[PDB]
Amino acid sequence: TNWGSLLQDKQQLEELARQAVDRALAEGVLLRTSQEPTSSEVVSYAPFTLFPSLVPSALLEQAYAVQMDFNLLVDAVSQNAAFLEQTLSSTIKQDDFTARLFDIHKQVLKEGIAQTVFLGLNRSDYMFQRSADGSPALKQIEINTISASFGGLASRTPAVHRHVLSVLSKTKEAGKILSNNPSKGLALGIAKAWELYGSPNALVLLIAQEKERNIFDQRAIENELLARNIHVIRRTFEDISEKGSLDQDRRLFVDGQEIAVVYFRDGYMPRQYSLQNWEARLLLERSHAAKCPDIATQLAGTKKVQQELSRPGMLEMLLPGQPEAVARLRATFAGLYSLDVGEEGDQAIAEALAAPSRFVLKPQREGGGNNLYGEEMVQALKQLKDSEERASYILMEKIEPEPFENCLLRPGSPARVVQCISELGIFGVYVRQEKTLVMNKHVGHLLRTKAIEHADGGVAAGVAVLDNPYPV
Amino acid sequence: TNWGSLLQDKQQLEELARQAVDRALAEGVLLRTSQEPTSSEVVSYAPFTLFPSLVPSALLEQAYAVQMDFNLLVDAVSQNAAFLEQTLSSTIKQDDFTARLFDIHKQVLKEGIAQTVFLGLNRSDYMFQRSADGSPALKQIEINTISASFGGLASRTPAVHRHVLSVLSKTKEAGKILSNNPSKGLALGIAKAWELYGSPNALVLLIAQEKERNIFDQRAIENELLARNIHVIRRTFEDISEKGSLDQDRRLFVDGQEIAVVYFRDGYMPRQYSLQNWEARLLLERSHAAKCPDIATQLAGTKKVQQELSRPGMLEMLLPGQPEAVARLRATFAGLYSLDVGEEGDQAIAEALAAPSRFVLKPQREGGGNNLYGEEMVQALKQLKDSEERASYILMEKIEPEPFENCLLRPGSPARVVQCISELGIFGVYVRQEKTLVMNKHVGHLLRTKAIEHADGGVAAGVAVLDNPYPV
Numbered sequence: 001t002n003w004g005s006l007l008q009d010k011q012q013l014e015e016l017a018r019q020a021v022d023r024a025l026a027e028g029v030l031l032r033t034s035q036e037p038t039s040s041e042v043v044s045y046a047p048f049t050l051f052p053s054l055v056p057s058a059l060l061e062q063a064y065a066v067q068m069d070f071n072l073l074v075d076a077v078s079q080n081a082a083f084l085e086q087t088l089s090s091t092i093k094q095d096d097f098t099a100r101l102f103d104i105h106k107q108v109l110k111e112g113i114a115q116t117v118f119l120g121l122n123r124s125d126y127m128f129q130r131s132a133d134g135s136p137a138l139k140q141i142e143i144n145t146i147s148a149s150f151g152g153l154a155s156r157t158p159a160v161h162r163h164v165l166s167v168l169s170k171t172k173e174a175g176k177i178l179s180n181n182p183s184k185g186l187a188l189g190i191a192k193a194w195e196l197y198g199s200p201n202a203l204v205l206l207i208a209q210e211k212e213r214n215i216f217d218q219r220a221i222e223n224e225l226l227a228r229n230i231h232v233i234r235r236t237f238e239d240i241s242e243k244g245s246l247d248q249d250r251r252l253f254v255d256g257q258e259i260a261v262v263y264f265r266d267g268y269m270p271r272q273y274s275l276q277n278w279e280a281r282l283l284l285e286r287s288h289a290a291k292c293p294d295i296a297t298q299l300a301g302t303k304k305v306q307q308e309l310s311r312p313g314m315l316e317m318l319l320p321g322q323p324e325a326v327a328r329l330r331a332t333f334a335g336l337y338s339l340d341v342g343e344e345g346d347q348a349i350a351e352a353l354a355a356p357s358r359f360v361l362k363p364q365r366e367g368g369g370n371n372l373y374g375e376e377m378v379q380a381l382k383q384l385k386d387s388e389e390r391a392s393y394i395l396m397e398k399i400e401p402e403p404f405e406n407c408l409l410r411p412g413s414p415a416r417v418v419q420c421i422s423e424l425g426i427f428g429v430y431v432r433q434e435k436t437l438v439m440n441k442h443v444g445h446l447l448r449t450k451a452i453e454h455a456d457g458g459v460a461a462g463v464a465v466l467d468n469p470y471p472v
Numbered sequence: 473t474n475w476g477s478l479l480q481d482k483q484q485l486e487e488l489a490r491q492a493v494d495r496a497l498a499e500g501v502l503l504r505t506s507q508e509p510t511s512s513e514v515v516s517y518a519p520f521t522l523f524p525s526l527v528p529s530a531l532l533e534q535a536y537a538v539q540m541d542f543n544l545l546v547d548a549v550s551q552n553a554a555f556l557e558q559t560l561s562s563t564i565k566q567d568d569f570t571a572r573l574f575d576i577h578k579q580v581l582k583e584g585i586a587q588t589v590f591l592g593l594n595r596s597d598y599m600f601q602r603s604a605d606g607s608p609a610l611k612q613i614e615i616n617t618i619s620a621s622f623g624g625l626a627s628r629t630p631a632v633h634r635h636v637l638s639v640l641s642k643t644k645e646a647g648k649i650l651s652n653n654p655s656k657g658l659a660l661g662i663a664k665a666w667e668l669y670g671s672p673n674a675l676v677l678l679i680a681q682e683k684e685r686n687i688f689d690q691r692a693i694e695n696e697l698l699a700r701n702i703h704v705i706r707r708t709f710e711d712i713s714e715k716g717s718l719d720q721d722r723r724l725f726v727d728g729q730e731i732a733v734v735y736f737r738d739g740y741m742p743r744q745y746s747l748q749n750w751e752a753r754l755l756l757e758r759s760h761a762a763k764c765p766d767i768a769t770q771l772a773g774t775k776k777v778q779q780e781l782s783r784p785g786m787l788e789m790l791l792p793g794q795p796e797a798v799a800r801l802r803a804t805f806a807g808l809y810s811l812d813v814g815e816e817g818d819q820a821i822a823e824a825l826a827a828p829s830r831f832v833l834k835p836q837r838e839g840g841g842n843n844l845y846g847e848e849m850v851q852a853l854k855q856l857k858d859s860e861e862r863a864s865y866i867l868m869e870k871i872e873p874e875p876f877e878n879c880l881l882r883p884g885s886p887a888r889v890v891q892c893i894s895e896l897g898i899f900g901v902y903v904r905q906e907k908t909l910v911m912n913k914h915v916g917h918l919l920r921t922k923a924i925e926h927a928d929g930g931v932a933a934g935v936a937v938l939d940n941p942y943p944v
């Protein structure tokens with residue numbers, strides 16, 4: 001178990017790190033370099049821990065047992081239009097980006113949805129909260145419903161931790177690492193959706209920007225598709241505007257080829273959309289191809305929607321008659337507070353101002369680097385208290401897991417032995433034809449770990465690194 | 473079959489190349505960059521063809537059916553001391569490098585061989601000669617008995633060619649690519665040798681320079697060892713001099729750890745040895761650890777020894793009573809000429825001077841970039857004719873295979889559609905305890921291809937790229 005003990009001897013560290021890095025590159029745990037995000041002529045290893053972080057087996061089991069419930073929940077939200085408008089009514093007057101996303105959802109609702117096949121590829125993230133007894137409890141940090149990444153690379157890292165332990169003759173521990181293959185499962189969902197669309201020669205369209213350091217993780221899904229004779233074409237929103245078009249039955253065509261599924265790897269942040277990219281996203285949502293996620297499902301992944309769902313009776317109204325599901329889901333909720341104009345918002349603000357190390361302030365963003373904490377959160381709250389703008393955020397109880405030592409490897413920086421905390425993610429996959437759920441599953445996990453000084457996180461954002469859960 | 477047809481459309485080429493490269497990096501077909509040969513912080517794909525080159529199945533079968541014979545042959549040569557001294561008697565007065573190798577072999581013979589376990593990991597290379605009928609015939613180019621590389625990377629590229637064909641929906645052709653796993657087999661030989669040495673905690677010592685772009689191909693063998701709980705330590709000759717020592721029973725110790733097998737990845741060229749590296753190689757050959765190859769076996773891989781073995785009755789005297797083996801081996805020999813002082817040497821020189829595009833002039837070197845052809849060969853022959861120095865070389869019939877179009881991918885250069893020729897290699901593995909052959913096998917193949925303008929070759933030397941034999 002204890003890694004700290006293996007991290008005190010320096011010559012041995014340098015050697016195990018050398019071992020890990022070479023095995024990681026051989027297993028395909030790669031990213032393009034930051035200096036040339038459009039080129040695969042040169043690449044490096046994605047950041048990762050030297051050893052797999054210990055994770056309570058019961059919590060890992062618990063995270064897995066609630067994924068099917070969260071896939072149901074996200075899918076009920078995306079279909080209940082009144083819930084989404086009421087939930088986001090205040091956010092959309094203050095947040096341009098949520099307004100545009102919501103406005104596409106509205107135009108689409110208006111014209112009628114062309115698509116008849118629906119699917120979600122997501123990742124639900126949790127932390128381990130020290131509880132009353134002392135028992136760590138599984139608490140949800142967020143749910144990611146657009147461009148849920150790192151499932152390809154995560155299938156490749158276990159071999160890397162087994163290797164590091166083998167070098168030290170810890171064959172027992174090496175043997176306990178869990179094998180994990182999420183990209184197979186994510187791919188199977190797009191496969192199912194393609195099958196159901198029903199056009200033998202239609203392609204899966206992957207939406208990605210040209211500067212994309214994480215191409216290998218996307219290629220992994222493409223490899224699993226390609227093995228089942230489903231072809232993917234990669235294109236940017238700009239490409240869609242120049243070459244995407246709808247036929248008479250609203251079929252999407254790209255370069256004359258028919259698209260069955262639109263898998264988004266881009267478009268979860270405002271910086272990714274110019275005026276024309278917004279038209280291309282509307283164009284894709286208006287089409288008959290299955291969308292991954294469709295625009296409503298992307299709205300279901302907002303932090304505001306997450307906060308609303310914790311209010312008593314909210315789970316019950318979305319998943320009526322499903323009390324055990326309701327319970328599994330609710331056990332994972334930590335404190336979530338609306339900051340809308342009103343008494344509840346005023347109270348949450350006063351609590352955050354009184355004990356700022358215990359809350360996080362979150363805008364309706366995705367992908368890391370956008371939440372506010374401690375000093376910045378305090379300063380922002382003091383300006384937001386009296387502004388309508390407050391409605392663009394939500395406030396949340398900070399989980400503060402017990403820190404454990406590990407060693408982080410990131411290209412270009414020396415191996416770093418430090419106190420770290422992890423975040424456990426479970427990938428979910430579901431597909432529905434009209435209103436019948438045809439596939440609903442969990443497909444694997446992702447443990448992301450970071451050095452203790454980072455309030456925020458995310459691998460693509462440069463903070464957390466890839467890891468594997470060592471069951472204890 | 474015909475690749476030329478898929479190489480005429482430019483937008484599609486750029487796209488299949490992009491596909492191949494990304495799949496190649498994901499499968500671990502890597503080299504460190506040339507600018508930082510000591511760092512794995514950044515890497516690229518090893519050069520490779522876009523499609524697998526067509527290879528006559530009968531010749532590929534033939535190359536495989538003679539490997540066990542060549543392993544026997546190389547092993548008989550390394551044990552027959554009179555043959556080696558007589559063969560190399562003239563070379564050693566003119567070639568310092570062969571003199572030093574030979575001198576270590578002599579000192580070791582003198583002190584008596586400490587080692588009791590012997591093994592060879594090699595690669596026998598052939599080209600396809602247009603023959604009388606028109607039928608291509610398998611002809612040996614050389615046999616590589618020291619640092620026989622690219623067996624790890626070759627286990628990884630088939631998935632890459634299957635991918636490229638799959639993208640084009642040629643599932644039939646993709647299905648014909650042969651799976652290949654030489655590093656498993658090479659590793660099994662060092663494993664056998666370690667087993668036989670018999671010390672549970674002794675390590676396999678890999679001799680490699682610090683600047684080594686091909687580390688991943690070496691790590692592949694280390695991975696297979698590590699999976700069988702055999703540990704490898706990587707060290708340079710300089711490290712051996714500073715920290716290697718022999719005990720009383722001539723046991724090799726490195727940093728206090730006992731070495732069972734010495735696997736050479738360096739030391740096949742004079743530039744790799746300073747005066748102290750020469751002492752370290754002698755020190756390792758004097759030891760009780762199994763050597764891969766041992767110094768005599770390295771001498772058995774010289775081009776001069778190859779030339780001598782083609783003389784009538786020479787195979788017969790090395791492998792007495794083995795006529796079918798003799799025949800399989802002899803069928804692969806092309807014309808080989810001694811250039812020693814004397815009538816035969818004068819005649820070969822006159823033939824080479826009369827038709828220089830048909831011969832190659834070879835020094836006793838290894839690894840590519842050292843032979844002489846056409847203009848340089850002619851100029852060298854005119855100076856060597858009357859010199860004692862002529863004995864440092866041998867002359868050989870050039871094989872001129874039919875060229876076929878393929879596309880070569882090399883990092884930093886645009887995909888290049890060109891006429892190419894291939895070289896088929898078969899990896900051999902054998903182990904012997906005292907005088908009993910305990911393992912003798914072929915373990916996989918390596919197809920190396922190059923653009924037609926290159927007289928010479930080799931992947932590490934920058935000319936040939938990795939490929940796969942498409943059986944026709």
Ligand SMILES: Nc1ncnc2c1ncn2[C@@H]1O[C@H](COP(=O)(O)OP(=O)(O)O)[C@@H](O)[C@H]1O
Pocket residue numbers: 125127141142360362365366367368369370371396397398399400423455456457458
């Ligand atoms: N409630 C929380 N307790 C602890 N850390 C949190 C909490 N909320 C957010 N974070 C930290 O910030 C990171 C990013 O926040 P997140 O809610 O997941 O939004 P994003 O969609 O930007 O990832 C998390 O992975 C975690 O490191």
Ligand SMILES: Nc1ncnc2c1ncn2[C@@H]1O[C@H](COP(=O)(O)OP(=O)(O)O)[C@@H](O)[C@H]1O
Pocket residue numbers: 597599613614832834837838839840841842843868869870871872895927928929930
């Ligand atoms: N006899 C030959 N016919 C054709 N090409 C040859 C011949 N001999 C050498 N070469 C070319 O030069 C390369 C290097 O020669 P080789 O004999 O294999 O020595 P090295 O040990 O340097 O590889 C070969 O892979 C091939 O491209």
Ligand SMILES: N[C@@H](CCC(=O)N[C@@H](CS)C(=O)NCC(=O)O)C(=O)O
Pocket residue numbers: 123144146147148149150212213214217218264265266268366367368448458459460461464
């Ligand atoms: N361009 C990347 C990044 C997308 C991204 O960061 N996705 C978020 C959901 S919005 C996530 O899964 N990131 C995980 C990680 O960064 O830790 C892609 O498709 O890989």
Ligand SMILES: N[C@@H](CCC(=O)N[C@@H](CS)C(=O)NCC(=O)O)C(=O)O
Pocket residue numbers: 595616618619620621622684685686689690736737738740838839840920930931932933936
């Ligand atoms: N440093 C390299 C290069 C050694 C080398 O070039 N080996 C030769 C035998 S001397 C060979 O197999 N080379 C094949 C290739 O370059 O095509 C190593 O261990 O990989």
Ligand SMILES: [Mg+2]
Pocket residue numbers: 125142367368
């Ligand atoms: Mg997150």
Ligand SMILES: [Mg+2]
Pocket residue numbers: 142143144365366367368
């Ligand atoms: Mg998120």
Ligand SMILES: [Mg+2]
Pocket residue numbers: 597614839840
């Ligand atoms: Mg050669």
Ligand SMILES: [Mg+2]
Pocket residue numbers: 614615616837838839840
């Ligand atoms: Mg050679």
